[PDB]
Design a protein around this ligand. Structure first.
Ligand SMILES: Nc1ncnc2c1ncn2[C@@H]1O[C@H](COP(=O)(O)OP(=O)(O)OP(=O)(O)O)[C@@H](O)[C@H]1O
Ligand SMILES: Nc1ncnc2c1ncn2[C@@H]1O[C@H](COP(=O)(O)OP(=O)(O)OP(=O)(O)O)[C@@H](O)[C@H]1O
Ligand SMILES: [Mg+2]
Ligand SMILES: [Mg+2]
Ligand SMILES: [Zn+2]
Lengths: 308, 618
């Protein structure tokens, strides 16, 4: 599994022919050239890579295991939906009428958490999180022009991590030959770094238990019952009960490049949701597992956890 | 009721559906339709057991109930959405499962019914310029499926008569504390036993049923199916637009009025207003946010009384499409700028005419306010009060809430703006900026009278002021955010979060206690700012003095600044005025939220910066 690290930058298209320089002078703008720089678009590599991206096919040959964002503090993740605000408290499943339920203890207040904290959470060692440990990401404001003015907002991010499973497309070699790549459908370019190793978060060892949990780190497409079904068959274990702690479905669209049309809308369990499972017999919880539809496009990344 | 069973109804989604709106009319339609769905669900329970068996909301005086069940002749009050998306009722155990399936069906059929009626209405009115056969494709499964699956009506129930070890039931449900174990003790006292009937711990049962109910709602709302590929709705951009799978973007747009393709849900939304009109002969007084904005200082009335006639004349002149019923089609034609971008020389008359009017009457209000109010800690405060007698006190609480929402909230809003929703302790209203503060204050005050220095029943609120051109979706998001993340985030809640979002993108937020509104309104400071740009620099200088702690201290800095900017007509007046303004600033500081004096001064002066903005309060 390779780890690709993107460092995004917005592109400013400047002209050598401008009216008033007093403007850019007051802002102290400096335009320094970047010699020997290798740029390129993902709309061009997708350069021989045609042999791994089906023409008119929805998914590629390789699998995008998942994507995570990072700030100056490193990689961060949506605060697990069962962590309620008061200090933030971790609330585990209770029971009633033989059914797993989430005891009422307050409203969930969204935010992010560092991999460090999520790691303690997945091991069931986290009881609460000091509010200064919970991250809030500032929204970036841009004026969008499609190619009518638009309002474009997105999270203030420093890094984007992509985990890729390459069956033999030579992706590591292609990417390694580039320093910069312009993203898809945006005037953004990014620096590219490629590491030939799999991340710690995926090599964890949770041991074996009957009370397991699965944190959805990327949107996971599928009806609850189906996901719980896929989980049983994948782990060859029976699930006597489960509880999905989530908010509401998020609409996933996508562009069908073959049809020159938008893809059919799909609904997904949003990142941050936690699936609490109670197996019949002990299971050795995997560090991570892919569930639902469009796995190869990055959806369905679930991180294994434990609860008591 | 044979075997008493507590039943809970939950309908989602709410805010996401309301936010998917382009005009005020859509906004009102989403909210009203939501209340309509709950009503359809409750009538299923009333038919079998009557209203007295519906604990919450209180049907007794619900307009919807009086007009659609007991068939009365209620008026425009029917326009308000008074039913929340959640309800609790006592029914018969053997009937519960039927009732569940029965509620899902009446809601499903009602929506399909509105959809087909909407398709007919749409084609017969130019909404969608389509073929004769193509009209039948609008009713195919793909579109029907979207209507059938958009809303989730979830029902869960529990027997009130079954016996259980009280301690173990609450412990296992993760509800056991000291305060709860203590209550459970007094319970085991009354009935010399610890194994009681579920209704014995009713207060804790409501909380547990809520959790059991929430488990089910998330399980059902995710049982959705995929949609056909194609261009999406222009209003929500989420669901496939009708004919979105048959045409390219350009040809799809040409088939729709205003070139805005709609999806099944947003079509129902556009039709809902006429449906209600045909059903009750009623329609909202203000249809656009612009209509609510022009209520500022009676500009709309004034202008209409001294320029209303001519404008329509010169309008009709430029074109006959801008006029109708001797009045403009859209209220935005009241803005010069609308003509310049939305027979040239024939238009130059309109522009010059309007600009001229603005000279004598003043520029037209372009900002309006969105008010959202919501009870603080209602869940705990209610169960606390309730802590077979309990259910009765719960009904009493609910009736007190329905009474407040139906009669009292309605009374302070009158026709000063548009009251869209009022479901008990919660409110959604669109108001002109010069009424927002007072309206919110009165609603908070009335709420306090209906439920009585350290009050137990409180309301927090968000008031967002925006330009009439601001996307409604974003405005609702920001109003909710002011309520949930700003006001409700203040320890002790009971706060009003005021946000001013200028067209330029600048965003000013002030967190205040309710009394700031009273104290400010009656202040000499308020009168002096209105007759001054002295106010602007005074506010600029104070704020600059509190980007950090001022060396000389807050009091000394405030006295100094007051002296530098406040003056009367003679030493006599100016001295008393400086002493009065200084003391009012200190009284106001008492009501601004903040972790310290620097933060309080900043919040107060940010608030002042907001209500003295000439663009918003011309
Ligand atoms: N018909 C309505 N019109 C306007 N506001 C409503 C209406 N119904 C309910 N509300 C308000 O919306 C609030 C719920 O908003 P929300 O979107 O969070 O729904 P929810 O029931 O919490 O479902 P979800 O699980 O999706 O959050 C209710 O508590 C009430 O304050
Ligand atoms: N009269 C009532 N009887 C029983 N339940 C009620 C009654 N009125 C409202 N409720 C329920 O209480 C819920 C409170 O929801 P909300 O999201 O406002 O939480 P809250 O307990 O009010 O806390 P806060 O608003 O401070 O976050 C309402 O959404 C509704 O589900
Ligand atoms: Mg909610
Ligand atoms: Mg509340
Ligand atoms: Zn739509």
């Amino acid at each position: 599994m390779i780890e690709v690290t993107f460092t995004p930058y917005d592109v400013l298209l400047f002209r050598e022919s401008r009216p008033f320089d007093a403007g850019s002078e007051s802002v102290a703008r400096s335009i320094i050239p970047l010699p020997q720089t290798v740029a390129g678009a993902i709309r061009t590599l997708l350069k021989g890579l045609k042999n791994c991206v089906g023409v008119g096919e929805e998914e590629p040959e390789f699998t995008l295991v998942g994507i995570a964002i990072g700030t100056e503090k490193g990689r961060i993740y949506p605060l697990p939906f069962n962590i309620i605000k008061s200090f933030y408290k971790v609330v585990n499943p209770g029971r009633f009428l033989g059914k797993l339920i989430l005891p009422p203890k307050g409203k969930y207040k969204s935010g992010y958490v560092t991999e460090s904290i999520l790691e303690k959470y997945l091991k069931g060692e986290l009881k609460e999180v000091e509010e200064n440990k919970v991250i809030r990401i500032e929204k970036e404001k841009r004026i969008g022009i499609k190619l009518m003015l638009y309002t474009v907002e997105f999270l203030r991010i420093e890094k984007i991590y992509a985990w890729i499973e390459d069956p033999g497309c030579g992706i590591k070699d292609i990417l390694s030959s580039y320093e910069f790549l312009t993203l898809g459908g945006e005037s953004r370019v990014a620096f590219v770094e490629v590491d030939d190793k799999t991340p710690d978060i995926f090599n964890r060892e949770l041991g074996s238990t009957k009370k397991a949990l699965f944190y959805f780190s990327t949107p996971t497409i599928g009806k609850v019952g189906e996901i719980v079904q896929e989980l049983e068959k994948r782990l060859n274990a029976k699930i006597d009960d489960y509880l999905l702690v989530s908010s509401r479905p998020t609409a996933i669209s996508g562009w069908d490049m073959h049809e020159k049309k938008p893809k059919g809308t799909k609904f997904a369990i949003p990142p941050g949701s936690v699936l609490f499972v109670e197996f019949k017999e002990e299971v050795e919880v995997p560090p991570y597992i892919k569930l639902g539809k469009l796995k190869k496009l990055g959806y369905g990344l679930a991180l294994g956890g434990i609860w008591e | 009721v044979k075997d008493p069973t507590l039943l809970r109804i939950k309908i989602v989604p709410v805010q996401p559906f309301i936010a998917n709106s382009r005009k005020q009319l859509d906004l009102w339609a989403s909210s009203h339709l939501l209340s309509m769905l709950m009503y359809k669900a409750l009538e299923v329970i009333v038919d079998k057991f009557g209203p007295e068996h519906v604990i919450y909301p209180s049907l007794r005086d619900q307009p919807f109930f009086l007009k659609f069940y007991l068939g009365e002749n209620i008026g425009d009050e029917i326009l308000v959405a008074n039913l929340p998306n959640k309800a609790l009722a006592i029914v018969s155990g053997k009937e519960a499962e039927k009732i569940e399936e029965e509620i899902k069906k009446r809601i499903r059929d009602f929506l399909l019914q509105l959809y087909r009626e909407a398709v007919d209405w749409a084609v017969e009115n130019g909404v969608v310029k389509v073929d004769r056969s193509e009209k039948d494709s609008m009713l195919k499964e793909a579109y029907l499926k979207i209507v059938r699956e958009y809303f989730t009506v979830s029902i869960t129930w529990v027997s009130l008569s079954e016996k259980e070890d009280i301690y173990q039931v609450t412990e296992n449900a993760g509800l056991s504390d000291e305060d709860v174990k203590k209550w459970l003790k007094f319970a085991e006292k009354k009935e010399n036993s610890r194994v009681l009937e579920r209704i014995a711990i009713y207060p804790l049962l409501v909380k547990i049923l809520d959790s059991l109910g929430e488990r089910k709602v998330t399980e059902e709302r995710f049982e959705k199916s995929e949609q056909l590929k194609g261009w999406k709705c222009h209003v929500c951009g989420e669901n496939l637009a009708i004919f979105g799978d048959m045409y390219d973007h350009d040809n799809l747009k040409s088939l729709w009025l205003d070139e805005e393709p709609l999806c099944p849900m947003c079509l129902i939304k556009r039709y809902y207003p006429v449906w209600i009109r045909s059903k009750t002969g009623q329609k909202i007084r203000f249809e656009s946010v612009v209509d609510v904005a022009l209520l500022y200082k009676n500009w709309r009335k004034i202008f209409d009384e001294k320029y209303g006639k001519d404008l329509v004349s010169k309008a009709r002149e430029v074109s006959e499409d801008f006029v109708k019923d001797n009045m403009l089609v859209d209220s935005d034609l009241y803005y010069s700028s609308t003509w310049e971008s939305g027979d040239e020389e024939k238009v130059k008359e309109v522009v010059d005419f309007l600009n001229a009017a603005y000279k004598e009457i003043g520029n037209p209000p372009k900002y309006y306010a969105i008010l959202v109010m919501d009870g603080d800690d209602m869940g705990k405060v209610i169960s606390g009060e309730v802590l077979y007698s309990t259910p009765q006190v719960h009904v009493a609480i609910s009736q007190a809430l329905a009474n407040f929402s139906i009669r009292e909230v309605r009374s302070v809003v009158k026709d000063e703006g548009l009251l869209i929703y009022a479901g008990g302790d919660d409110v959604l209203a669109i108001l002109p900026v010069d009424k927002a503060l007072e309206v919110a204050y009165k609603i908070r005050k009335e709420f306090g009278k209906s439920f009585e220095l350290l009050p137990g029943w409180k309301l927090s609120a968000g008031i967002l002021i925006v330009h009439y051109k601001h996307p409604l979706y974003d405005a609702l998001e920001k109003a909710r955010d002011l309520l949930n993340n700003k006001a409700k985030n203040v320890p002790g809640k009971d706060t009003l979060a005021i946000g001013l979002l200028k067209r330029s993108g600048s965003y000013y937020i002030s967190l205040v206690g309710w009394e700031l509104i009273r104290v400010f309104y009656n202040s000499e400071l308020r009168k002096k700012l209105l007759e001054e740009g002295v106010g602007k620099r005074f506010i600029y200088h104070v704020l600059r003095e509190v980007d950090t702690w001022p060396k000389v201290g807050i009091d000394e800095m405030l006295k100094f600044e007051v002296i530098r900017h406040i003056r009367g007509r003679n030493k006599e007046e100016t001295k008393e005025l400086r002493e009065k303004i200084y003391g009012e600033i200190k009284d106001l500081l008492e009501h601004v939220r903040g972790n310290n004096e620097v933060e309080k001064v900043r919040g107060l002066f940010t608030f002042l910066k907001i209500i003295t903005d000439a663009e918003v309060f011309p």
